[PDB]
Amino acid sequence: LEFVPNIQLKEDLGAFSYKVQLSPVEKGMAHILGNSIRRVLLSSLSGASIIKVNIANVLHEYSTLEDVKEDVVEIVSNLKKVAIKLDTGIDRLDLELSVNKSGVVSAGDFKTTQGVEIINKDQPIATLTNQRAFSLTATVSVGRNVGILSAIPTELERVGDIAVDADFNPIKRVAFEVFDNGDSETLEVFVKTNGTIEPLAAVTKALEYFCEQISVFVSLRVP
Amino acid sequence: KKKSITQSNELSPGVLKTVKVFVAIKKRIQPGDKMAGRHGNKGVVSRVLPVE
Numbered sequence: 692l693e694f695v696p697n698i699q700l701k702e703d704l705g706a707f708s709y710k711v712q713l714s715p716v717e718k719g720m721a722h723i724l725g726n727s728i729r730r731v732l733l734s735s736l737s738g739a740s741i742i743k744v745n746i747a748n749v750l751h752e753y754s755t756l757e758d759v760k761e762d763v764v765e766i767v768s769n770l771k772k773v774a775i776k777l778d779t780g781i782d783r784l785d786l787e788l789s790v791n792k793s794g795v796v797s798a799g800d801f802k803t804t805q806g807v808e809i810i811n812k813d814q815p816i817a818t819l820t821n822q823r824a825f826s827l828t829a830t831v832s833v834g835r836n837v838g839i840l841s842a843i844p845t846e847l848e849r850v851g852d853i854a855v856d857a858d859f860n861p862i863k864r865v866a867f868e869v870f871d872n873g874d875s876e877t878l879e880v881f882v883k884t885n886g887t888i889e890p891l892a893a894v895t896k897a898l899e900y901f902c903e904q905i906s907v908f909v910s911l912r913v914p
Numbered sequence: 915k916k917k918s919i920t921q922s923n924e925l926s927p928g929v930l931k932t933v934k935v936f937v938a939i940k941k942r943i944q945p946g947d948k949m950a951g952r953h954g955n956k957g958v959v960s961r962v963l964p965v966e
Binding site: 729730733734753838839 | 938942944962964965966
């Protein structure tokens with residue numbers, strides 16, 4: 692009378708879709724692990740994103756550069772949809788971008804400094820109708836979502852600074868299903884992310900958080 | 915651009931100087947605003963629930 696699960700990355704597919712699995716379970720506890728995984732995976736996982744940007748010859752968001760089919764606010768909206776991957780202990784740094792081309796400024800043209808990563812290499816940032824200079828920065832920061840209310844407005848210092856709101860959590864869909872195997876079951880969790888993390892690491896992290904939160908009820912003491 | 919009255923208006927005599935200021939602000943929807951589909955149904959946004 693002893694069952695304990697191990698985790699397996701079976702059935703990859705699609706853009707960034709996966710189907711992680713935990714093979715043996717306790718015949719009844721499956722539907723607990725499923726719900727806990729889902730909810731904690733949808734609310735607390737932290738990533739990194741752009742939060743503040745400064746363009747070269749601009750003063751505010753409702754403006755317009757020359758020879759650019761785009762606008763400033765359209766550009767700021769483009770920037771929000773970039774998928775950035777940061778390493779273990781960076782937690783804040785700066786990105787740079789300076790170009791003198793005459794086409795479409797994709798996000799691949801960010802400076803390939805250390806630590807950073809730019810997964811969404813196809814995403815346009817701006818379209819230059821004619822050849823010209825173009826430059827900016829963007830402070831990338833770790834973070835997690837907290838709700839539209841308890842968010843600090845991210846103080847600005849320089850003149851051209853322009854706050855950019857940031858959606859951190861890299862998870863887009865979760866769904867589980869539980870299968871019976873006879874005195875035992877197997878859990879089959881779907882995950883889909885932006886590609887900024889690996890699935891196995893993700894689910895392991897979520898269960899770590901969850902058990903960390905449970906570990907008070909083993910004591911019935913304060914902390 | 916200079917065929918004005920040297921101050922851009924007749925100034926409605928008695929007025930020395932005036933200035934116009936233009937301020938812009940984004941606004942997001944919040945508990946209390948009023949939505950309505952095209953079919954005559956309407957209501958007031960009552961809460962905002964977390965994704966999960």
